[PDB]
Amino acid sequence: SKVVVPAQGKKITLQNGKLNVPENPIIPYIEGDGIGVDVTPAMLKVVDAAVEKAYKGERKISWMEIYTGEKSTQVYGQDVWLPAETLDLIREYRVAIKGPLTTPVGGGIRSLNVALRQELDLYICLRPVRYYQGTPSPVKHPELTDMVIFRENSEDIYAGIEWKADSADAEKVIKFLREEMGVKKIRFPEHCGIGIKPCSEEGTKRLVRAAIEYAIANDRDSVTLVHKGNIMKFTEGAFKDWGYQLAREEFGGELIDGGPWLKVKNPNTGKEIVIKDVIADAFLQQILLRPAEYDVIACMNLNGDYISDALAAQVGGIGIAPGANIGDECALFEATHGTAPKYAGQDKVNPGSIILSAEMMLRHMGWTEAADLIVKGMEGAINAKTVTYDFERLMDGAKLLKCSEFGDAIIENM
Amino acid sequence: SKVVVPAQGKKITLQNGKLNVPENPIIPYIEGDGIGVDVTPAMLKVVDAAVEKAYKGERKISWMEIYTGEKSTQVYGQDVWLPAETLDLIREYRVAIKGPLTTPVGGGIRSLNVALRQELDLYICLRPVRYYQGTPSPVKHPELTDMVIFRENSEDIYAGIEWKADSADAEKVIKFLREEMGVKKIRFPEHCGIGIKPCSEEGTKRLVRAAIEYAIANDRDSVTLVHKGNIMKFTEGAFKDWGYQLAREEFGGELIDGGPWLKVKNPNTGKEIVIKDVIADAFLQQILLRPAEYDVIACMNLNGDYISDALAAQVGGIGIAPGANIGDECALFEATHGTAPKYAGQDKVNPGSIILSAEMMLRHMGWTEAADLIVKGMEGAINAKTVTYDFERLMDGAKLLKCSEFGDAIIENM
Lengths: 414, 414
Ligand SMILES: NC(=O)c1ccc[n+]([C@@H]2O[C@H](COP(=O)([O-])OP(=O)(O)OC[C@H]3O[C@@H](n4cnc5c(O)ncnc54)[C@H](OP(=O)(O)O)[C@@H]3O)[C@@H](O)[C@H]2O)c1
Ligand SMILES: NC(=O)c1ccc[n+]([C@@H]2O[C@H](COP(=O)([O-])OP(=O)(O)OC[C@H]3O[C@@H](n4cnc5c(O)ncnc54)[C@H](OP(=O)(O)O)[C@@H]3O)[C@@H](O)[C@H]2O)c1
Ligand SMILES: [Mg+2]
Ligand SMILES: [Mg+2]
Description:
It is classed as oxidoreductase. 2 copies of one chain form a homodimer. By secondary structure, chain A is an alpha/beta fold.
């Protein structure tokens, strides 16, 4: 009802598991709450400039704004935080992007970001993390970090199945667990909240499958399965076992030494990709102490959350970390940082995150030239130390830029 | 049957919620698997030296070795990994300490470390983390880190309640969830593992209670409740709500500004202790970017695992991180790092972790003088760069020492 489909522009379609993108594709976008009002306009201009430069005017995106979050309430009404139309529009146009999102509290509403991911079944949470020269970082050698996180995005405790303490449902579940399943490990059964942790084999192998194919298509060195399987054997541990099994079953994985590591040969470059695994808590230590040993990462939903945020912070890219939610039919790229209401509307915020997510979007669309130009632009702008306040306040000799001005700096460095 | 109670020596007792420790207390200790054979003898000698120096020979510990893990199998038999006697002996002597521990794989045995914690109901996992000058660290300013982690140690998914995919029990649980609880969020119900996440109110407030009393007795600046309550509202979020409520209920917590932070006045120093909270994933970023803003931390079992390991790695103390498991009746201090079988028996390993855990043990025993001397010793030895290979290999100008030699260096610096 309130969305306006672009007069000029054409729908992207999916054929043969492959995207068919017109030169004039219509792309849905969500402004985002808080600073989304600052970063998204900058993102629109940077992407258009990259597309214009790369294809000489032969291609052009027809942006179409759709709504979710606060602006949705103001467009559709009181408690319309996520209109069904938004979901239909992302399905119909295949690819879309959105800015910061905030969930309401006090109304029993669960995460809108997760709702998008689960109802569009974007089971892949892709977070590429690497260091941009010139970025202020808390660690000594952030350049050693160059990883690609494949976060399972549909299942685990992150899936929102739980019951409140003292509620009739929670006591019912606890009764079933203690009396019918013989559970004795619940230390305090009364006044106790209960949550469910699911992890299936199909969900695990389509995620790991995507991670290995990514390592192959991008010639990466290895794929590490991160889990907490020594404590959670049937979910975390199963994820790791199913991951190795997939590698053996579909990619000719061979045993390295006496195991458990495997090696998969890259069908295109002949490189032997190492398949290995590391327990999650020790991994949070290894990304700091031996970051160069890791590359592509495959893990569950919650651990992926933790890992991606920790890696982003160590390379100083907490506000420029790109992110994408991908499934077999649809794809939603997104800022990954918060709404930042206290600077919203001041044209202060750092647009690097949503812009790099737009870079991932264009590359996903096959427009690798334009995506390359955006990376080049971020490269030069940050290296030139012409950046926003979140960077500049942590360093010396930098030129402070507004959010919009930083967008121009990126374009200038393309 | 194979343990030998010290001829000379007396049992520690608990009276009025307060430990009564004799000058000649008997202390049970577990050597530990792998490098435990290297670090524990060094720990024994360092503690004895600190006790001898601090009380002029008037006090002395009567060590008593008890077994768990591989040595237990070789002492008690084939699959005796954790003899009931060990548990009885820790109960009877109140305080004990143990080296690295490894769980068997392939026999359906769950974590021995967790088994100890849950059957002795040591619901407090205490991990003090701060930087020792001279320690090689991956971050720029490790000195800014000075935190005390209070990890809930008895409940959460860490409690081992789960069922294997395709097993009759898992399908039974899934059937109950879908058909009797109306669960629709399990993406793939078949071939799916299931785990249970419990979190009670009593378990939460006795843990947070201990953290606040610790902030009071040690005059710390604040207590931060770390959780992932925006996704797991009834466990993680409940933990955070119950934490604030406890602070209000028992420590006169007052609202700061418009909330949610609270302030508790230290009854002994008048200092206003800040009670606040931070979402777990963002917290893993904050410990790196703004470490000086945090002090005492209160959180659930799994997050505590992650947080303590990440903090230990950033201050370069992955092998010297002290740790303790404390309950209302018993206490078990422990190395916190792995078994390191590939250097076991070579007198290479770093004994700093179990020694600092022994320092926590002595202080818990009221022997603060002796504990102070151990900290002093670690202080000087590390600052003097006379350390073991794990430190020395990451730095220049250091004097390489064997594990035992490092123990002597600590004594020499008391
Ligand atoms: N991908 C997303 O769309 C996304 C992700 C995460 C959260 N959020 C949402 O946003 C809402 C806003 O509220 P909050 O203020 O309590 O957020 P918050 O806890 O996420 O704050 C993140 C902090 O990072 C900094 N920051 C974030 N984005 C930045 C940018 O672009 N440039 C510079 N600094 C940036 C600000 O810290 P300082 O610079 O002040 O230190 C900021 O307040 C949250 O409720 C959350 O629902 C959206
Ligand atoms: N608190 C405990 O008692 C405790 C804790 C955690 C694990 N463990 C147990 O130990 C077993 C041993 O097997 P793993 O070798 O596969 O272990 P692992 O994955 O824990 O290895 C930890 C790594 O840290 C280093 N390290 C650990 N302790 C060290 C010390 O004291 N000094 C110097 N470096 C040290 C070694 O790495 P590099 O120096 O080689 O890089 C080491 O292999 C594990 O199965 C686990 O059950 C015991
Ligand atoms: Mg996250
Ligand atoms: Mg741990």
